[PDB]
CSV table of C-alpha atoms in Angstrom, one decimal:
chain,number,residue,atom,x,y,z
X,1,UNK,CA,8.3,-32.2,4.1
X,2,UNK,CA,4.8,-30.7,4.2
X,3,UNK,CA,5.1,-28.2,7.0
X,4,UNK,CA,4.7,-24.4,6.9
X,5,UNK,CA,7.2,-21.7,8.0
X,6,UNK,CA,7.0,-20.7,11.6
X,7,UNK,CA,7.2,-16.9,11.8
X,8,UNK,CA,8.8,-16.7,15.2
X,9,UNK,CA,8.6,-12.9,16.0
X,10,UNK,CA,4.9,-12.8,14.9
X,11,UNK,CA,3.9,-16.1,16.5
X,12,UNK,CA,2.3,-17.1,13.2
X,13,UNK,CA,2.5,-19.6,10.3
X,14,UNK,CA,3.2,-18.9,6.7
X,15,UNK,CA,2.6,-21.1,3.7
X,16,UNK,CA,2.2,-19.6,0.2
X,17,UNK,CA,1.3,-16.7,-2.1
X,18,UNK,CA,-1.1,-18.2,-4.7
E,1,UNK,CA,0.8,-44.0,35.9
E,2,UNK,CA,3.8,-43.4,33.6
E,3,UNK,CA,5.6,-40.5,31.9
E,4,UNK,CA,7.0,-39.4,28.6
E,5,UNK,CA,10.6,-39.6,27.2
E,6,UNK,CA,12.4,-36.7,25.6
E,7,UNK,CA,13.4,-36.5,21.9
E,8,UNK,CA,17.0,-37.1,20.9
E,9,UNK,CA,19.7,-35.9,18.4
E,10,UNK,CA,18.2,-32.4,18.4
E,11,UNK,CA,19.9,-30.3,15.8
E,12,UNK,CA,19.5,-26.8,14.5
E,13,UNK,CA,20.8,-26.0,11.0
E,14,UNK,CA,21.0,-22.7,9.2
E,15,UNK,CA,19.3,-23.4,5.9
E,16,UNK,CA,18.9,-19.9,4.7
E,17,UNK,CA,19.0,-16.1,5.2
E,18,UNK,CA,17.2,-15.9,8.6
E,19,UNK,CA,16.0,-19.4,8.0
E,20,UNK,CA,16.6,-22.3,10.4
E,21,UNK,CA,15.7,-26.0,10.3
E,22,UNK,CA,15.2,-27.8,13.5
E,23,UNK,CA,15.6,-31.6,13.4
E,24,UNK,CA,15.3,-34.4,16.0
E,25,UNK,CA,14.3,-38.0,16.4
E,26,UNK,CA,11.7,-39.8,18.5
E,27,UNK,CA,13.1,-41.4,21.7
E,28,UNK,CA,13.9,-45.1,21.0
E,29,UNK,CA,12.2,-46.4,24.2
E,30,UNK,CA,8.8,-44.7,23.9
E,31,UNK,CA,5.9,-46.2,22.0
E,32,UNK,CA,6.5,-46.5,18.3
E,33,UNK,CA,3.3,-45.6,16.5
E,34,UNK,CA,1.2,-43.7,19.0
E,35,UNK,CA,-0.1,-41.3,16.5
E,36,UNK,CA,-1.4,-38.7,19.1
E,37,UNK,CA,1.7,-37.9,20.9
E,38,UNK,CA,3.3,-34.8,19.5
E,39,UNK,CA,6.2,-32.4,19.9
E,40,UNK,CA,6.2,-29.0,21.5
E,41,UNK,CA,8.8,-26.5,20.4
E,42,UNK,CA,9.8,-23.4,22.5
E,43,UNK,CA,12.1,-20.7,21.3
E,44,UNK,CA,14.0,-19.3,24.3
E,45,UNK,CA,16.0,-16.7,22.4
E,46,UNK,CA,16.2,-14.1,20.8
E,47,UNK,CA,12.4,-13.8,21.2
E,48,UNK,CA,10.3,-16.2,23.2
E,49,UNK,CA,7.9,-18.4,21.1
E,50,UNK,CA,5.9,-21.5,21.6
E,51,UNK,CA,4.2,-24.0,19.2
E,52,UNK,CA,3.3,-27.6,18.4
E,53,UNK,CA,4.2,-29.9,15.5
E,54,UNK,CA,3.7,-33.5,14.7
E,55,UNK,CA,6.8,-34.0,12.4
E,56,UNK,CA,10.3,-34.6,13.6
E,57,UNK,CA,11.4,-31.4,12.0
E,58,UNK,CA,10.4,-27.7,11.8
E,59,UNK,CA,11.5,-24.9,9.5
E,60,UNK,CA,11.3,-21.4,11.0
E,61,UNK,CA,12.0,-17.8,10.1
E,62,UNK,CA,13.9,-15.6,12.6
E,63,UNK,CA,16.8,-13.2,12.8
E,64,UNK,CA,20.2,-14.9,13.6
E,65,UNK,CA,22.6,-12.1,14.5
E,66,UNK,CA,21.7,-12.3,18.2
E,67,UNK,CA,22.2,-16.1,18.3
E,68,UNK,CA,19.4,-18.6,18.6
E,69,UNK,CA,18.1,-21.0,21.3
E,70,UNK,CA,15.5,-23.7,21.0
E,71,UNK,CA,14.0,-26.5,23.1
E,72,UNK,CA,11.8,-29.4,22.1
E,73,UNK,CA,9.9,-31.9,24.1
E,74,UNK,CA,7.4,-34.8,23.7
E,75,UNK,CA,3.8,-34.0,24.7
E,76,UNK,CA,0.4,-35.7,25.1
E,77,UNK,CA,-2.6,-33.5,25.5
E,78,UNK,CA,-5.7,-34.9,26.9
E,79,UNK,CA,-8.3,-32.1,27.5
E,80,UNK,CA,-8.0,-32.7,31.3
E,81,UNK,CA,-4.2,-33.1,31.4
E,82,UNK,CA,-1.0,-32.2,29.6
E,83,UNK,CA,1.7,-34.8,29.7
E,84,UNK,CA,5.3,-33.6,29.0
E,85,UNK,CA,8.8,-35.0,28.9
E,86,UNK,CA,11.9,-33.1,29.9
E,87,UNK,CA,13.2,-30.6,27.4
E,88,UNK,CA,15.9,-31.4,24.9
E,89,UNK,CA,17.8,-28.3,23.9
E,90,UNK,CA,20.1,-26.9,21.2
E,91,UNK,CA,21.7,-23.6,20.3
E,92,UNK,CA,23.3,-21.5,17.5
E,93,UNK,CA,26.0,-19.3,19.0
E,94,UNK,CA,25.9,-15.6,18.3
E,95,UNK,CA,28.1,-15.0,15.3
E,96,UNK,CA,31.8,-14.0,16.1
E,97,UNK,CA,32.6,-10.3,16.3
E,98,UNK,CA,33.9,-7.6,18.6
E,99,UNK,CA,31.4,-5.1,20.1
E,100,UNK,CA,30.2,-2.1,18.2
E,101,UNK,CA,31.5,-3.3,14.8
E,102,UNK,CA,27.9,-4.2,13.9
E,103,UNK,CA,25.8,-1.9,11.6
E,104,UNK,CA,23.3,0.4,13.4
E,105,UNK,CA,19.9,2.0,12.4
E,106,UNK,CA,19.0,-0.2,9.3
E,107,UNK,CA,16.2,1.4,7.3
E,108,UNK,CA,14.4,-0.1,4.3
E,109,UNK,CA,11.9,1.2,1.8
E,110,UNK,CA,10.1,-0.6,-1.0
E,111,UNK,CA,8.3,1.2,-3.8
E,112,UNK,CA,6.1,0.1,-6.7
E,113,UNK,CA,6.8,1.3,-10.2
E,114,UNK,CA,6.2,0.3,-13.8
E,115,UNK,CA,8.4,-1.1,-16.6
E,116,UNK,CA,8.8,1.3,-19.4
E,117,UNK,CA,7.2,0.5,-22.8
E,118,UNK,CA,5.4,-2.6,-24.2
E,119,UNK,CA,7.7,-5.3,-22.8
E,120,UNK,CA,4.9,-6.4,-20.5
E,121,UNK,CA,2.4,-4.1,-18.6
E,122,UNK,CA,3.3,-4.9,-15.0
E,123,UNK,CA,5.0,-3.7,-11.9
E,124,UNK,CA,8.5,-3.8,-10.4
E,125,UNK,CA,9.3,-3.3,-6.7
E,126,UNK,CA,12.4,-1.2,-5.9
E,127,UNK,CA,14.2,-1.6,-2.6
E,128,UNK,CA,16.2,1.2,-1.0
E,129,UNK,CA,18.2,0.7,2.2
E,130,UNK,CA,20.2,3.1,4.5
E,131,UNK,CA,22.3,2.7,7.7
E,132,UNK,CA,25.1,4.1,9.8
E,133,UNK,CA,28.6,2.5,10.1
E,134,UNK,CA,29.4,0.7,13.3
E,135,UNK,CA,30.7,3.2,15.9
E,136,UNK,CA,34.0,1.5,16.8
E,137,UNK,CA,34.3,-0.3,13.5
E,138,UNK,CA,37.9,-0.2,12.1
E,139,UNK,CA,38.1,2.4,9.3
E,140,UNK,CA,38.8,-0.5,6.8
E,141,UNK,CA,35.7,-2.6,7.0
E,142,UNK,CA,33.5,-3.0,4.0
E,143,UNK,CA,29.8,-3.8,4.4
E,144,UNK,CA,27.7,-6.1,2.2
E,145,UNK,CA,23.9,-6.5,2.0
E,146,UNK,CA,21.8,-9.5,0.9
E,147,UNK,CA,18.1,-9.9,0.9
E,148,UNK,CA,15.7,-12.9,0.7
E,149,UNK,CA,12.1,-12.9,-0.3
E,150,UNK,CA,10.5,-16.3,-0.5
E,151,UNK,CA,12.9,-18.6,-2.3
E,152,UNK,CA,14.9,-15.8,-3.9
E,153,UNK,CA,18.2,-14.4,-2.4
E,154,UNK,CA,20.3,-11.6,-3.9
E,155,UNK,CA,23.3,-9.4,-3.1
E,156,UNK,CA,23.3,-5.6,-3.9
E,157,UNK,CA,25.7,-4.0,-6.3
E,158,UNK,CA,24.6,-0.4,-6.5
E,159,UNK,CA,25.9,1.1,-3.2
E,160,UNK,CA,26.2,4.6,-1.9
E,161,UNK,CA,29.4,5.2,0.1
E,162,UNK,CA,30.6,7.8,2.7
E,163,UNK,CA,33.8,9.8,2.6
E,164,UNK,CA,36.1,7.0,3.7
E,165,UNK,CA,34.7,4.6,1.1
E,166,UNK,CA,32.3,2.5,3.2
E,167,UNK,CA,28.9,1.4,2.0
E,168,UNK,CA,26.1,3.1,3.9
E,169,UNK,CA,23.2,2.6,1.5
E,170,UNK,CA,21.9,0.2,-1.1
E,171,UNK,CA,19.7,0.5,-4.2
E,172,UNK,CA,17.8,-2.3,-5.9
E,173,UNK,CA,16.0,-0.9,-9.0
E,174,UNK,CA,14.5,-4.3,-9.8
E,175,UNK,CA,13.8,-7.1,-7.2
E,176,UNK,CA,12.1,-10.4,-6.6
E,177,UNK,CA,9.6,-8.9,-4.1
E,178,UNK,CA,6.0,-9.4,-4.9
E,179,UNK,CA,4.0,-6.2,-5.3
E,180,UNK,CA,0.9,-7.6,-3.6
E,181,UNK,CA,3.1,-9.6,-1.1
E,182,UNK,CA,2.2,-10.8,2.4
E,183,UNK,CA,5.5,-12.5,3.1
E,184,UNK,CA,8.4,-11.2,5.2
E,185,UNK,CA,11.4,-9.6,3.6
E,186,UNK,CA,14.6,-10.7,5.2
E,187,UNK,CA,17.7,-8.4,5.1
E,188,UNK,CA,21.2,-9.4,6.1
E,189,UNK,CA,24.2,-7.2,6.2
E,190,UNK,CA,27.6,-8.6,7.1
E,191,UNK,CA,31.1,-7.1,6.7
E,192,UNK,CA,34.8,-7.7,6.5
E,193,UNK,CA,38.1,-6.2,7.5
E,194,UNK,CA,41.8,-7.1,7.8
E,195,UNK,CA,42.0,-6.5,11.6
E,196,UNK,CA,38.9,-7.2,13.7
E,197,UNK,CA,36.0,-9.5,12.8
E,198,UNK,CA,32.6,-7.9,12.1
E,199,UNK,CA,29.3,-8.6,13.7
E,200,UNK,CA,26.7,-9.4,11.1
E,201,UNK,CA,23.3,-7.7,11.5
E,202,UNK,CA,19.9,-8.8,10.2
E,203,UNK,CA,16.2,-7.7,10.2
E,204,UNK,CA,12.8,-9.0,9.2
E,205,UNK,CA,10.4,-6.5,7.6
E,206,UNK,CA,6.7,-7.0,6.9
E,207,UNK,CA,6.0,-5.4,3.5
E,208,UNK,CA,3.0,-3.4,4.8
E,209,UNK,CA,5.4,-1.7,7.3
E,210,UNK,CA,7.9,-0.5,4.6
E,211,UNK,CA,5.9,-0.3,1.4
E,212,UNK,CA,6.1,3.4,0.4
E,213,UNK,CA,2.7,3.8,-1.3
E,214,UNK,CA,2.9,6.3,-4.2
E,215,UNK,CA,0.9,9.6,-4.3
E,216,UNK,CA,-2.3,9.9,-6.2
E,217,UNK,CA,-1.7,11.5,-9.7
E,218,UNK,CA,-3.6,13.9,-11.9
E,219,UNK,CA,-5.5,15.5,-9.0
E,220,UNK,CA,-8.0,17.7,-10.8
E,221,UNK,CA,-10.3,20.2,-9.1
E,222,UNK,CA,-12.8,22.7,-10.4
E,223,UNK,CA,-15.4,25.0,-9.0
E,224,UNK,CA,-18.5,25.8,-11.1
E,225,UNK,CA,-20.4,28.4,-9.2
E,226,UNK,CA,-21.3,26.7,-5.9
E,227,UNK,CA,-20.4,23.2,-7.1
E,228,UNK,CA,-17.0,21.7,-6.2
E,229,UNK,CA,-15.7,18.7,-8.1
E,230,UNK,CA,-12.4,16.8,-7.3
E,231,UNK,CA,-11.2,13.9,-9.3
E,232,UNK,CA,-8.0,11.8,-9.0
E,233,UNK,CA,-6.5,8.6,-10.3
E,234,UNK,CA,-5.6,5.6,-8.2
E,235,UNK,CA,-1.8,5.6,-7.4
E,236,UNK,CA,0.8,3.5,-9.1
E,237,UNK,CA,0.4,0.1,-7.4
E,238,UNK,CA,-0.5,-3.5,-8.1
E,239,UNK,CA,-3.5,-3.2,-5.7
E,240,UNK,CA,-6.7,-2.5,-7.7
E,241,UNK,CA,-9.0,0.5,-7.6
E,242,UNK,CA,-11.2,-0.8,-4.8
E,243,UNK,CA,-8.3,-1.3,-2.4
E,244,UNK,CA,-7.5,2.3,-1.4
E,245,UNK,CA,-8.5,4.5,1.4
E,246,UNK,CA,-8.3,8.2,0.4
E,247,UNK,CA,-8.0,11.4,2.4
E,248,UNK,CA,-8.9,14.6,0.5
E,249,UNK,CA,-7.6,17.7,2.2
E,250,UNK,CA,-9.4,20.9,1.2
E,251,UNK,CA,-7.6,23.9,2.7
E,252,UNK,CA,-9.1,27.4,2.7
E,253,UNK,CA,-6.1,29.7,2.1
E,254,UNK,CA,-8.1,32.7,3.4
E,255,UNK,CA,-9.1,31.6,6.9
E,256,UNK,CA,-7.2,28.4,7.3
E,257,UNK,CA,-10.3,26.2,7.6
E,258,UNK,CA,-9.4,22.6,6.9
E,259,UNK,CA,-11.9,20.2,5.5
E,260,UNK,CA,-10.8,16.5,5.4
E,261,UNK,CA,-12.9,13.8,3.6
E,262,UNK,CA,-12.2,10.1,4.2
E,263,UNK,CA,-13.5,8.0,1.3
E,264,UNK,CA,-12.9,4.9,-0.8
E,265,UNK,CA,-14.0,6.5,-4.0
E,266,UNK,CA,-12.1,8.4,-6.7
E,267,UNK,CA,-14.2,11.6,-7.0
E,268,UNK,CA,-15.7,14.0,-4.5
E,269,UNK,CA,-18.6,16.3,-5.6
E,270,UNK,CA,-20.0,18.7,-3.0
E,271,UNK,CA,-20.8,22.3,-2.1
E,272,UNK,CA,-18.3,25.0,-1.4
E,273,UNK,CA,-18.0,28.8,-1.2
E,274,UNK,CA,-17.4,30.8,-4.4
E,275,UNK,CA,-15.3,33.6,-3.0
E,276,UNK,CA,-12.4,31.8,-1.3
E,277,UNK,CA,-9.2,30.4,-2.8
E,278,UNK,CA,-8.7,26.7,-1.9
E,279,UNK,CA,-5.7,24.4,-2.2
E,280,UNK,CA,-6.5,20.7,-2.4
E,281,UNK,CA,-4.3,17.7,-1.8
E,282,UNK,CA,-5.0,14.0,-1.7
E,283,UNK,CA,-3.3,11.0,-0.1
E,284,UNK,CA,-3.9,7.2,-0.2
E,285,UNK,CA,-3.4,4.1,1.9
E,286,UNK,CA,-4.2,0.4,1.3
E,287,UNK,CA,-7.5,-0.7,2.7
E,288,UNK,CA,-7.6,-3.2,5.6
E,289,UNK,CA,-9.7,-5.5,3.4
E,290,UNK,CA,-6.7,-6.0,1.1
E,291,UNK,CA,-3.8,-5.9,3.6
E,292,UNK,CA,-3.0,-5.2,7.3
E,293,UNK,CA,-2.6,-1.5,8.1
E,294,UNK,CA,0.4,0.2,6.5
E,295,UNK,CA,1.8,3.6,5.6
E,296,UNK,CA,0.1,6.7,4.2
E,297,UNK,CA,1.4,8.0,0.9
E,298,UNK,CA,2.8,11.5,0.6
E,299,UNK,CA,0.3,14.3,-0.2
E,300,UNK,CA,-0.2,15.0,-3.9
E,301,UNK,CA,1.6,18.3,-4.8
E,302,UNK,CA,-1.1,20.9,-4.0
E,303,UNK,CA,-3.4,22.4,-6.7
E,304,UNK,CA,-5.4,25.6,-6.4
E,305,UNK,CA,-9.0,26.5,-7.2
E,306,UNK,CA,-11.4,29.3,-6.6
E,307,UNK,CA,-10.7,33.0,-7.0
E,308,UNK,CA,-10.2,32.2,-10.7
E,309,UNK,CA,-11.0,35.8,-11.5
């Protein structure tokens, strides 16, 4: 609960699309 | 001087289409509420990655057709030292299936279009996919495609087949993909047969890498004496007027001279020669202010101007 998605191949984080 | 103890009960669950959940628990022996010891996660395969988290879980997006391997350990980073326990590891085995049965050369294209009439004045994204059948895939196999964008997951129903009845393409007229999206489109294609088992295949597409931007429409050009005026409308897209880079190609049909203007505007007024016939075309891309670099649209179908007489 309350963590973002780890985009593995891009070494990045992702949260939302407000 | 003392050291750290590794996490335990490290699990990896497939929660979604190219979506994994990593769970584990803090080692029973180590300090209970030391709020500044954390967890380092390393992805060993398919692609190597490395990141920190403070929770005893971690959701992640990655392809799964090549298997999956992860390690997690307990860490304490002073800014002079890094303290680390031994790794705890877990794996997801590569999905069962004989060699070469997997699909090859998966290609995907999204395109922005509009509704029809006054239902609502908005935009639909269409998704088109193509591929080749597995080389040594038993003549009986049928292929099936799913996609996931955000929370939404769907299977295709409008397929294009070959000569032996096997699906080699897919068409989504209407989809759950956001027209201004930043997120990753996940595509999975698995298959089935009576004989051998089929290797599933899957890919992650960034929208900006596969969004087929539409061409500018109503390209108008007129020469009045020495004055050249070119106008054109912003292409069919959810991105607004101020989000497009344009290239205007002015080709002199007589001597081949090629004038190219790069501009963020919607009209070009300048000076040109009376006595040559020109053909103009325009193409567009989404500015880097609005999204990471993507694809150029096709050229507008050429229009001619000059030598009106």
